[PDB]
Design a protein around this motif. Structure first.
Motif, PDB file in Angstrom:
ATOM      1  N   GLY A 123       0.826  -1.192   0.000  1.00 36.49           N
ATOM      2  CA  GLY A 123       0.000   0.000   0.000  1.00 36.49           C
ATOM      3  C   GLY A 123       0.861   1.241   0.000  1.00 36.49           C
ATOM      4  N   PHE A 124       0.202   2.393  -0.002  1.00 34.55           N
ATOM      5  CA  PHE A 124       0.931   3.651  -0.051  1.00 34.55           C
ATOM      6  C   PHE A 124       0.998   4.277   1.333  1.00 34.55           C
ATOM      7  N   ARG A 184       1.289   7.058   4.250  1.00 34.27           N
ATOM      8  CA  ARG A 184       0.600   8.326   4.430  1.00 34.27           C
ATOM      9  C   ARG A 184       1.575   9.493   4.372  1.00 34.27           C
ATOM     10  N   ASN A 200       4.708   8.398   8.458  1.00 34.08           N
ATOM     11  CA  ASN A 200       4.919   6.964   8.368  1.00 34.08           C
ATOM     12  C   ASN A 200       6.200   6.594   9.101  1.00 34.08           C
ATOM     13  N   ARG A 205       3.762   9.800  -0.867  1.00 34.69           N
ATOM     14  CA  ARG A 205       2.774   8.729  -0.897  1.00 34.69           C
ATOM     15  C   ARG A 205       3.197   7.607  -1.851  1.00 34.69           C
ATOM     16  N   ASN A 255       3.969   3.877  -3.355  1.00 34.34           N
ATOM     17  CA  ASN A 255       3.574   2.487  -3.205  1.00 34.34           C
ATOM     18  C   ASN A 255       4.714   1.719  -2.557  1.00 34.34           C
ATOM     19  N   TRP A 256       4.381   0.881  -1.587  1.00 28.99           N
ATOM     20  CA  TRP A 256       5.356   0.263  -0.712  1.00 28.99           C
ATOM     21  C   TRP A 256       4.927  -1.156  -0.389  1.00 28.99           C
ATOM     22  N   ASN A 257       5.890  -2.070  -0.434  1.00 30.86           N
ATOM     23  CA  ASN A 257       5.690  -3.466  -0.082  1.00 30.86           C
ATOM     24  C   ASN A 257       6.786  -3.883   0.880  1.00 30.86           C
TER      25      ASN A 257
END
Lengths: 53, 53
Positions: free
Chosen positions: A1-2, A4, A8, A17, A19-21
């Motif tokens: 998800g992205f 905040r 964060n 913001r 996208n992150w895994n």
């Protein structure tokens, strides 16, 4: 998800913001990046803070 | 050098003052990343903005 924009826990604190895994290993230790316990315990060492703050 | 917290032109706009190195090619075009002219001309295409804003 992205992550905040406001705030964060990634050590670079990105504000675009992105996208992150990220994968944790729930179970025995395998590596520092995927170990919650290792990161939590070594939070008193700034040099070991490479993934999550 | 390290990018300023207040404001920098990198498309992700980092605010952690990261050490940063970038090479431009002053001369004939070789690639998009190192071409100032290419990035400047294609600034009307958001999808081509991958290095500098």
């Amino acid at each position: 998800g992205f992550l905040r924009w406001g705030g964060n826990a990634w050590y670079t604190h990105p504000d675009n913001r992105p996208n992150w895994n990220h994968t944790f290993v729930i179970g025995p230790y395998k590596d520092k990046a995927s170990s919650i316990r290792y990161q939590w315990d070594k939070r008193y060492i700034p040099g070991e803070v490479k993934w999550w703050d």
